[PDB]
Tab-separated table of C-alpha atoms in Angstrom:
chain	number	residue	atom	x	y	z
N	1326	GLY	CA	-24.508	-20.748	-9.002
N	1327	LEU	CA	-25.449	-22.391	-5.713
N	1328	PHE	CA	-24.954	-19.669	-3.119
N	1329	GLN	CA	-26.141	-16.653	-5.177
N	1330	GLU	CA	-23.384	-14.738	-3.377
N	1331	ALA	CA	-20.555	-12.353	-4.244
N	1332	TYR	CA	-17.353	-11.823	-2.324
N	1333	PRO	CA	-16.040	-8.290	-1.800
N	1334	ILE	CA	-12.329	-7.604	-2.217
N	1335	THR	CA	-10.087	-5.011	-0.639
N	1336	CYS	CA	-11.275	-1.734	-2.123
N	1337	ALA	CA	-11.372	1.837	-0.884
N	1338	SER	CA	-12.190	5.418	-1.787
N	1339	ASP	CA	-8.794	6.941	-1.055
N	1340	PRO	CA	-5.311	5.684	-1.892
N	1341	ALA	CA	-4.726	7.316	1.453
N	1342	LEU	CA	-6.988	4.658	2.907
N	1343	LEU	CA	-5.716	1.829	0.702
N	1344	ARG	CA	-2.200	2.120	2.128
N	1345	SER	CA	-3.480	1.298	5.610
N	1346	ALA	CA	-5.166	-1.885	4.397
N	1347	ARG	CA	-1.862	-3.407	3.309
N	1348	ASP	CA	-0.659	-4.605	6.697
N	1349	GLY	CA	-3.828	-6.142	8.147
N	1350	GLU	CA	-7.209	-5.035	9.416
N	1351	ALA	CA	-5.994	-4.510	12.995
N	1352	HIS	CA	-5.131	-0.848	12.466
N	1353	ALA	CA	-6.631	-0.329	9.009
N	1354	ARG	CA	-8.863	2.696	8.549
N	1355	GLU	CA	-12.444	1.504	8.136
N	1356	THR	CA	-13.746	4.932	7.092
N	1357	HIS	CA	-13.391	8.722	7.316
N	1358	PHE	CA	-15.730	11.789	7.120
N	1359	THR	CA	-17.442	10.566	3.939
N	1360	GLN	CA	-14.691	8.303	2.705
N	1361	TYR	CA	-15.001	4.571	3.109
N	1362	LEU	CA	-13.031	1.354	2.831
N	1363	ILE	CA	-14.073	-2.256	2.284
N	1364	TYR	CA	-11.785	-4.891	3.713
N	1365	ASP	CA	-11.500	-8.217	1.910
N	1366	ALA	CA	-14.196	-10.835	2.605
N	1367	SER	CA	-13.478	-13.758	0.334
N	1368	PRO	CA	-12.148	-17.305	-0.017
N	1369	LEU	CA	-9.078	-15.609	-1.446
N	1370	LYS	CA	-8.226	-13.873	1.828
N	1371	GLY	CA	-4.887	-14.475	3.491
N	1372	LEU	CA	-3.444	-15.834	0.263
N	1373	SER	CA	-0.395	-14.646	-1.660
N	1374	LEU	CA	-2.519	-13.392	-4.557
P	1326	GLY	CA	16.132	-5.754	-22.402
P	1327	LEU	CA	13.879	-8.816	-22.511
P	1328	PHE	CA	11.185	-7.405	-20.243
P	1329	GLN	CA	11.442	-3.718	-21.362
P	1330	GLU	CA	11.123	-2.709	-17.719
P	1331	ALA	CA	12.923	-0.593	-15.124
P	1332	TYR	CA	12.835	-0.895	-11.388
P	1333	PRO	CA	12.435	2.100	-9.058
P	1334	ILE	CA	14.377	2.222	-5.809
P	1335	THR	CA	14.304	3.943	-2.438
P	1336	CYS	CA	13.865	7.621	-3.242
P	1337	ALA	CA	11.918	10.676	-2.152
P	1338	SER	CA	12.052	14.451	-2.237
P	1339	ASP	CA	13.136	15.365	1.288
P	1340	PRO	CA	16.030	14.128	3.393
P	1341	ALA	CA	13.438	14.747	6.082
P	1342	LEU	CA	11.112	12.252	4.461
P	1343	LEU	CA	13.949	9.928	3.501
P	1344	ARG	CA	14.333	9.238	7.237
P	1345	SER	CA	11.423	6.799	7.223
P	1346	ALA	CA	13.167	4.436	4.821
P	1347	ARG	CA	15.279	2.842	7.556
P	1348	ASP	CA	12.296	0.999	9.038
P	1349	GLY	CA	10.822	-0.695	5.974
P	1350	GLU	CA	7.648	0.250	4.104
P	1351	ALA	CA	5.379	-0.548	7.071
P	1352	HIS	CA	5.022	3.073	8.145
P	1353	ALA	CA	6.929	4.729	5.298
P	1354	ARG	CA	5.641	8.256	4.720
P	1355	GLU	CA	4.340	8.165	1.163
P	1356	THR	CA	2.995	11.657	0.921
P	1357	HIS	CA	3.202	15.013	2.592
P	1358	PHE	CA	1.683	18.118	0.865
P	1359	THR	CA	3.868	17.776	-2.218
P	1360	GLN	CA	6.715	15.737	-0.831
P	1361	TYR	CA	6.431	12.298	-2.322
P	1362	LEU	CA	8.136	8.968	-1.734
P	1363	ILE	CA	8.437	5.802	-3.766
P	1364	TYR	CA	9.693	2.799	-1.803
P	1365	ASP	CA	12.040	0.279	-3.389
P	1366	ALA	CA	10.305	-2.216	-5.672
P	1367	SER	CA	13.002	-4.278	-7.358
P	1368	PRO	CA	14.820	-7.582	-7.100
P	1369	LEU	CA	17.162	-5.456	-4.985
P	1370	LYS	CA	14.547	-4.803	-2.303
P	1371	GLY	CA	15.325	-5.767	1.288
P	1372	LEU	CA	18.882	-6.762	0.395
P	1373	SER	CA	22.301	-5.780	1.716
P	1374	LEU	CA	22.425	-2.455	-0.125
């Protein structure tokens, strides 16, 4: 209500790509030929859930 | 009985692709052309046996 903002979560186009996001964004696949992945940008990041 | 659930364990379709179970699910080969793996998800994961 204050920020007018919206946090993106970990989401991707391929379950191929989603598997690489599990262990951190150091070696996670950002994208492919036309495939794409969104890493988590959120207050929830780093947490257990 | 209470949960009506059943846990999968360390299993795949090739002894070739079973080789990447003795390093954890970090770089476990999930999927070659048809040859599929499901890592252990259980209370028995990571344990002695």
